Amino acid sequence: RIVVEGLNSCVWVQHHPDRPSIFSRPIIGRYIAAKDAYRNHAYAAYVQNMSVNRTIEVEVPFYQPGLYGMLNASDNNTSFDRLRFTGLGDLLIGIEGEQPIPKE
């Protein structure tokens, strides 16, 4: 469940299952790694207008090519079980417009 309060413009949310989960903290804007936080085409997504409702409720599926999903994963230095078998992937949150963010 995602709540976006300072905007009255459309917001998107996309899910990347096969993306390796090698981060333990969310990264924002400029400081995000390039080729990331770029909206993809054929990924599960949901486009929502904040004029109608400013809380997004979605369900992220389990898409791992393995027997289990590993929780309580270490952070910094690998394997092949820590990047594709631990996390459900990454969720990208962006704004439909390129229009500047309000002062507040």
């Binding site: 459309c10 599960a44 997504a45 949901y46 486009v47 929502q48 207008n49 004029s51 109608v52 409702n53």
Partner: peptide, 9 residues
């Protein structure tokens, strides 16, 4: 609960 559109997925 109001929502803008139907599923995109």
């Amino acid at each position: 609960v109001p929502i803008p559109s139907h599923s995109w997925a």
